[PDB]
Write a protein that binds this ligand. Structure first.
Ligand SMILES: CN(C)c1nc2c(c(=O)[nH]1)N(C)CN2[C@@H]1O[C@H](COP(=O)(O)OP(=O)(O)OP(=O)(O)OC[C@H]2O[C@@H](n3cnc4c(=O)[nH]c(N)nc43)[C@H](O)[C@@H]2O)[C@@H](O)[C@H]1O
Length: 204
């Protein structure tokens, strides 16, 4: 079935000792989690719960009129952002038929840092690509980096931060090797200094 296909995070309560040297953080936009599947001709979006929420065309190698082939299917882990009609790419499980489930995440993240941009107008709205696909940036988890990101400006309403272990592979379901925290939470839970501002402002 198409359900339980996305790797899920857990609240990050315990702080990994090798955090700054073995983990990377991703700032996530507000939106809906989605399994994306481009296969022979078209692209389909599934919910975390497994059912299709859309079937359209995209500039992904998988489905599309112009660009298609056998086992040329591509599978992504995305967060759909309504206000921007954009599918923010979080992870890649399979590209052009090359599976990446058994690969460590820092490889997966780097592999999309360069292969997504290589697709002509993937980042723009177009007749064959009505929905934009934009890869999310990941950063180091050193104190300085965390401060950098927490003071950065994003083209979307930030929902939270995901913490990935560089070594873990891709396995569907919740896992401790992937952490989650609202931005205004890092100070307490991660015991570090942080730049005052929108992203670090706690709710009272
Ligand atoms: C709690 N947690 C560990 C967590 N929460 C997350 C994320 C995340 O990575 N981790 N996100 C990427 C986002 N998120 C929160 O869950 C919401 C999920 O909404 P969305 O996936 O876009 O719509 P959807 O139709 O899947 O919504 P669901 O019925 O699942 O209802 C939302 C609930 O799913 C659960 N959930 C979603 N993602 C995760 C997740 O990744 N881990 C865990 N443990 N739980 C999650 C939470 O209870 C969340 O409140 C987000 O809006 C945000 O409030």
């Amino acid at each position: 079935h198409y359900a339980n296909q996305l790797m899920l995070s857990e609240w990050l309560i315990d702080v990994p000792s090798d955090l700054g040297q073995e983990w990377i953080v991703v700032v996530c936009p507000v939106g809906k989690r989605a399994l994306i599947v481009a296969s022979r001709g078209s692209t389909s979006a599934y919910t975390k719960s497994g059912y299709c929420v859309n079937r359209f065309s995209s500039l992904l190698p998988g489905g599309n009129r112009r660009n298609s082939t056998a086992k040329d299917y591509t599978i992504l882990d995305c967060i759909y952002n309504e206000v921007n009609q954009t599918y923010y790419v979080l992870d890649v499980m399979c590209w052009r038929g090359h599976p990446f489930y058994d690969c460590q995440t820092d490889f997966r993240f780097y592999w999309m840092h360069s292969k997504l941009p290589e697709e002509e107008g993937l980042g723009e709205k177009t007749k064959l690509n009505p929905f934009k696909f934009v890869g999310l940036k990941n950063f180091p988890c050193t104190p300085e980096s965390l401060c950098d990101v927490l003071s950065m400006d994003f083209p979307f309403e930030v929902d939270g931060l995901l913490f990935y272990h560089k070594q873990t592979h891709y396995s569907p379901g919740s896992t401790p090797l992937v952490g989650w925290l609202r931005p205004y939470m890092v100070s307490d839970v991660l015991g570090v200094a942080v730049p005052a501002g929108p992203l670090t402002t706690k709710p009272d």
